[PDB]
Design a binder for this molecule. Structure first.
Ligand SMILES: CC(=O)c1sc(CCOP(=O)(O)OP(=O)(O)O)c(C)[n+]1Cc1cnc(C)nc1N
Ligand SMILES: CC(=O)c1sc(CCOP(=O)(O)OP(=O)(O)O)c(C)[n+]1Cc1cnc(C)nc1N
Ligand SMILES: CC(=O)c1sc(CCOP(=O)(O)OP(=O)(O)O)c(C)[n+]1Cc1cnc(C)nc1N
Ligand SMILES: [Ca+2]
Ligand SMILES: [Ca+2]
Ligand SMILES: [Ca+2]
Ligand SMILES: [Ca+2]
Ligand SMILES: [Ca+2]
Ligand SMILES: [Ca+2]
Ligand SMILES: [Ca+2]
Ligand SMILES: [Ca+2]
Ligand SMILES: [Mg+2]
Ligand SMILES: [Mg+2]
Ligand SMILES: [Mg+2]
Ligand code: NA
Ligand code: NA
Lengths: 567, 573, 567
């Protein structure tokens, strides 16, 4: 195909395959026509809603073959990451719901147990499929059940250490499971790493290796899968697909068609970071840039092109990224680790043990801080203030706009020790950006408005919304800048001169920046009323970022109501 | 009422609105009611700037409105616009960030004669030879569709360029692939001469609809409201679209409207015969002596100068339109019946009839003469028109007699020689005039395969193949070299080369053709086959495309003036 | 669900058994969800045959079924607000097989209409009258002791109108037994704006129930049954999706508000106005554009995109639109109120008292002047010349084509005071439009044709037809341009040089432009015969615009006949 259909395509066979049981009643000679019809519907519906695109096209045939051969949902199918699982959802009683995909109260971005019995494991983060499938296989055997266990994992997801740990353990217990490597020689960017060069190691680890086979030859897929379904012990099938298969524009540009917006401001914070990284690297030859397979997302694109000898994509290996930075810092170089808040969860131990405990000079640029929108709770950056500020030695910063991000990145970089700067997805208020590269004083907030009875202590990008509230209430507003060290002097002054302190952050209230203020007030015996605004103690369902923020009360309307209700 | 301008402005005309349309993006910010004023100003500037630099003239005036409408309606440069030939693309250049550079047009290091990809992002395809626009735009449209770029592809082709076979091939293929593209036939019932052919006859009556094309028109190519409205409607249509537009060559300038042939090109405002004129006189003279002579040109009566011949012998003159391939095979058929066809064709255009020359003429050893004008460097038209290869690509073809006259008298003599020769013959000569030597008025051949020693000397021998002879005689004076007017590349004067190789210390070959595969290499091949061990210095055109400039400037760059030849021989010795 | 509009009458055996509410009420609750599907099939089909309003009716298919199933119609009073959503209502009230005549001459009307059926309690078209009318019926029923129910279905858009606020407050005061059902789909024609939409009763004395799913028939029937017998003012909040059941309409609720029947001219006058508004705004920062919820119809689309800070949608609030403009003009701004002639009569007092009495600089761009076609007499712009020309200070203008509209908008805009420019729906003769922005002399007509004997004084778009008649009669023809101030010098000249003066206008003859000419002739004692052509003193039944103009004698044939008979 060359264009995305704008009207629903005619899919008479797909319409008869609304669930796997229905699909399995069709004949083999029908599956290649079904594949065509599924590809057309997929193009149509993702064109309608936006969403992940290329990876799903690559597994259209694999998905058909899997549900045709295996007795799903009794047999357990685990998709790694799940961004390639739209065909899976189309064939599991959700085709006519795809119009709600990634919309409030609609289908989720990834497989989700609560959404369908056909989703065995909620995914989003990568490389969990083998571990989860092995647990189900072990349990099923102990229960005396005869079900199969299958994990589909891409070549990029396979670069993570936890996939290696799983492959190793499965051999040890001699589990009856099938791992299918979906190898398209791609991640988001090109798959760079020693494992992609290799793509036997799988044989030597205790797995029976079959392949590589054509992942788009349905006859070979069904016959091969049929053979291995009833084979015993750890089985490993190497499949080769093409990302974007069947849509030429995506085959020709797999990066740009990894995801698309539905068919028909200022710079993104990631772009501000990318410019800062290039500018600082131009002035300091010691700066090194690290990403775990997210060059495009964190926006190290220009940096990678201009400073290729100082740019490092470690594949989907968050752990190694951080300890690698620690080693670089030991030799006097200046590593910057670009990592999403949600993915830094996977390198927590390396940050604590290898960086913080040693007080090594490593800067963490934490993107996608806060609510991330349609990708949903698996990717929310809800916790990084809480899980970092309890770590001794960490400098924790929360910029309120573009200029502040540039300044605090510079501040964290020039600081000799571990520093973190957190910022959200998307763009900001579009304030002027100072082109200079100058730091700000550590541990000092900035008073943005002087008012009367309420003091709003803002940690991060809710400042503009708090300013609206403060103009309505004639309140004091502080751009806190730093969670740790806290501007204790300023907090103390405001606690004496105001009747109510209000803290605002795009992080879990539990353990968050507002609780840092609470800890200070308590330790000094200051008993001013304190209202903590932030993310609630549940997982916020996917929606537009504005709808999720409104749900959490972090727009002007929600902030003002909370304040006035307290007063 | 439209006004007819009658004089070329000598001073920069006042064009305040054109100055606000320096690029298509700026033009598209203007209002549709301003475009007809813009068209008048663009015409005034066009007349002024070509009067300053010389260049192509009438064709550009005919597409002023069409060019304005195209950049107004289409999203250039993202939408792809392909101009056929490109001689009519001065308005295009003026609207695409090059207005104030038009003063450098066709000068060394200035704007080139035609659209050029390296010159501007608004130039999608380098043109010069005709009839490539449809094929090129089709390829662009096919690639854009596979890439998902939703680009528009537009080819503007004149009624003359549409007479070429390759345009017919592209129209038929575009229908097969159901390409989303627009072909605009710029019909003005003119080529350089009057457009004479069966296609021209059919276009006057009005299928492209029988082919897989949606035909719209004809429409007035000088009615900007209609052009804009029509292009707007067709821009968003799918599949192969064909818009028939009617224009007037020279529109707006009364002298060019009256005399479209004479105003196809002009020299900027304020010697012996041209070689083309020497050929034209020979053609008439031989035709008066031989009823068998037939004269053929692919739409270049004026350039090759068959003018007097076409008037004196209309029944024996054949303009085949821009159809180089058919011209050659037609000559072959004529020769089969005992007639004596002469194919007048520029060196750069004969490469489009190469297969007809080999397969239909040379394989059959048929009696056809090729009068190859514009051999060598052609000057301002630049590399797309360079006659750089005809010695190389003809000399490897068995049966070919290949000749290189050195002056006016030699051209007449070698035309007679190749004409009378019972088989295929080629005589190459350059644009412009020569040394103005006396021309023997008789019509007699010379001995085939024999050069003429024009200076007896020693030590160094200059083996000259063509018009650099006069420069080589200058160099020979200081060196006391011998100089041979070789006359024939094929058959080579082997007996003389063998003598000189034995009596001299250095052989120097000179030719206005690529050194690679050229006439010097024929000398080289002969020396090798006989085991002759004499140093050989091969002078000629280099292995790159020579940028446009005055002929003298291009020859100097390549080292084919007296100074360059002397330096080369001196540095070898 | 459905993706294409049926081209052949779909089989609807159960719908065909519910031809009236009494027949509907004999079916069982379990049959209603199938009935709803059959109704949508028929609705999509019939509107595809005739055209008309589309999305809103699809949104109330379930609500309409539930109301007639639970309530004892027609004895119980059901009032539909606006009525564009009442096609299902008509289909269920003995007009299903007459829907083929919908919006055609002598066929069913565009909206509910008392004369059309005993099931139509109140003729609607203009919005927000349902609560007032239902309250009136309830007060009367109570005094008569009838114990009948009174129900008003009102959309969230219609609820933004002041008169609905007035009805809600009075109903509370009198403690009326009535049910107000809010049909909340978060849509007007465009997206619903205003602080009410942002909020979406108890304090106003109403018992509020909901929100409930307006497409869940079990919940609807059960809820309505419960509230039917509750006493006092009852308020039910229902949530529906505009275009429910037809994917293209659900995706594009604005474009599917109304459709043309399934199967080259100049710009619509509304488009000429929209282009003028943009052109003038680019030359004058003072211009502000106001619309009461009719961005699409009046065509402020491009203006609202290019000048969003100077565009104001006040919801369905004609009154406030005008007084707001008066306020902006007090500060030196140049407001333009875009408003249909038929809707301007709801802001008559604000035009008189707040604008004209103060002689404030406000331009009224009066669209839909004259006959409007299939929407019928509730929407006719029949009276604006009559009700505006009697108001001192008003500049009243009647452009005859596209170029004249642009010129007279500029004239009224630059005029320092109140100005009105009226023009019809649809397109015009397609004459060239001068791109410049210059006014014309106030109070002067232009002679378009010099003739003799009879002079045609044309105010507005009948000029083209008058020119046709003038061809056969060799008549003088004047494009008057201005009703007020009148070109008295020109009328004086014509009265002394012709035997008959003929006035032509697309406005009521009574009080119209022709009567301004007669008033001048009388005051000067000029006794030239006067023939006044225009709209008759009755409400013209819906039909094609060309058929309604022919009925009124305002086409060339009708004008010619009337002139010849007078002569
Ligand atoms: C969007 C998202 O979450 C994806 S998809 C993807 C690479 C996918 O490569 P794979 O070869 O496994 O699949 P393919 O697309 O079919 O080639 C990454 C790194 N991410 C972000 C990411 C980063 N880091 C971790 C631990 N998990 C995830 N999901
Ligand atoms: C100078 C040059 O290269 C031109 S312009 C022209 C005819 C132009 O006719 P057209 O109708 O297509 O355009 P118009 O001028 O607007 O009428 C010819 C034959 N030539 C010489 C020529 C000969 N043969 C070929 C293959 N290409 C070219 N360019
Ligand atoms: C009939 C007409 O011209 C319609 S329909 C409509 C939208 C009403 O939205 P609502 O939420 O009440 O209904 P919905 O379609 O179900 O969402 C408007 C503003 N209008 C124009 C209009 C303007 N102003 C007034 C006083 N009355 C009307 N009818
Ligand atoms: Ca540092
Ligand atoms: Ca945010
Ligand atoms: Ca204050
Ligand atoms: Ca000339
Ligand atoms: Ca011969
Ligand atoms: Ca002689
Ligand atoms: Ca010379
Ligand atoms: Ca004007
Ligand atoms: Mg991959
Ligand atoms: Mg031509
Ligand atoms: Mg609504
Ligand atoms: Na993309
Ligand atoms: Na519509």
């Amino acid at each position: 195909l060359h264009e995305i259909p704008r009207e629903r395509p005619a899919t008479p066979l797909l319409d008869r395959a609304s669930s796997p049981a229905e699909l399995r009643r069709l004949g083999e000679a029908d599956l290649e026509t079904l594949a065509d019809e599924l590809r057309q519907y997929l193009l149509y519906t993702v064109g309608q809603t936006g969403g992940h695109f290329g990876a799903g096209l690559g597994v259209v045939e694999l998905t058909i073959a899997l549900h045709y051969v295996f007795d799903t949902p009794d047999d357990r199918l685990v998709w790694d990451v799940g961004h390639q699982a739209y065909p899976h959802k189309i064939l599991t009683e959700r085709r006519e719901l795809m119009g709600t995909l990634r919309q409030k109260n609609g289908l989720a971005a990834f497989p989700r147990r609560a959404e369908s019995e056909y989703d065995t494991f909620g995914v989003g983060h990568s490389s969990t499929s083998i571990s989860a499938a092995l647990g189900m296989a072990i349990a099923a055997r102990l229960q005396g059940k005869e079900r199969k266990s299958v994990a589909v994992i891409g070549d990029g997801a396979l670069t993570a250490g936890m996939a290696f740990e799983a492959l190793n353990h499965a051999s040890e217990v001699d589990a009856d499971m099938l791992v299918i490597l979906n190898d398209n020689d791609m991640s988001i960017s090109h798959n760079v790493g020693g494992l992609s060069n290799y793509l036997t190691l799988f044989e030597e680890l205790g797995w029976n290796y079959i392949g590589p086979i054509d992942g788009h030859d349905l006859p070979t897929l069904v016959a091969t899968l049929r053979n291995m379904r009833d084979m015993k012990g750890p089985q490993f099938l190497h499949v080769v697909t093409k990302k974007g298969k069947g849509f030429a524009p995506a085959e020709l540009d797999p990066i740009g068609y990894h995801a698309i917006t539905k068919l028909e401001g200022g710079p993104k914070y990631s772009s501000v970071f990318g410019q800062w990284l290039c500018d600082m690297a131009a002035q300091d030859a010691r700066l090194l840039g690290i990403t775990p397979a997210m060059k495009e997302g964190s926006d190290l694109v220009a940096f990678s092109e201009r400073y290729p000898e100082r740019y490092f994509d470690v594949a989907i290996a968050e752990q190694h990224a951080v300890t690698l930075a620690a080693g670089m810092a030991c030799e006097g170089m200046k590593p910057v680790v670009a990592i999403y808040s949600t993915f830094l969860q996977r390198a927590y131990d390396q940050l604590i043990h290898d960086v913080a405990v040693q007080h090594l000079d490593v800067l963490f640029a934490i993107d996608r801080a806060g609510l991330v929108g349609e990708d949903g709770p698996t990717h929310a950056g809800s916790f990084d203030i809480s899980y970092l500020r309890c770590i001794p030695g960490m400098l924790v910063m929360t910029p309120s706009d573009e200029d502040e991000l540039r300044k605090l990145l510079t501040t964290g970089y020039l600081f000799d020790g571990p520093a973190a700067v957190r910022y959200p997805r998307g763009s900001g208020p579009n304030h002027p950006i100072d082109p200079d590269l100058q730091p700000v004083e550590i541990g000092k907030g900035v008073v943005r408005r002087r008012g009367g009875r309420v003091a709003l202590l803002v940690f991060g990008v809710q400042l503009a919304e708090a300013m609206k509230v403060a103009e309505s209430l004639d309140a004091t507003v502080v751009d806190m800048r730093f969670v740790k060290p806290l501007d204790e002097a300023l907090v103390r002054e405001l606690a004496g001169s105001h009747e109510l302190l209000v803290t605002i952050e795009e992080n879990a209230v539990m353990g968050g920046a507002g609780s840092a203020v609470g800890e200070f007030l308590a330790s000094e015996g200051l008993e001013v009323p304190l209202l903590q605004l932030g993310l609630p103690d549940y997982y916020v369902e996917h929606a537009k970022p504005s709808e999720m923020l409104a749900e959490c009360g972090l727009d002007a309307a929600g902030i003002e109501k909370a304040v006035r209700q307290r007063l």
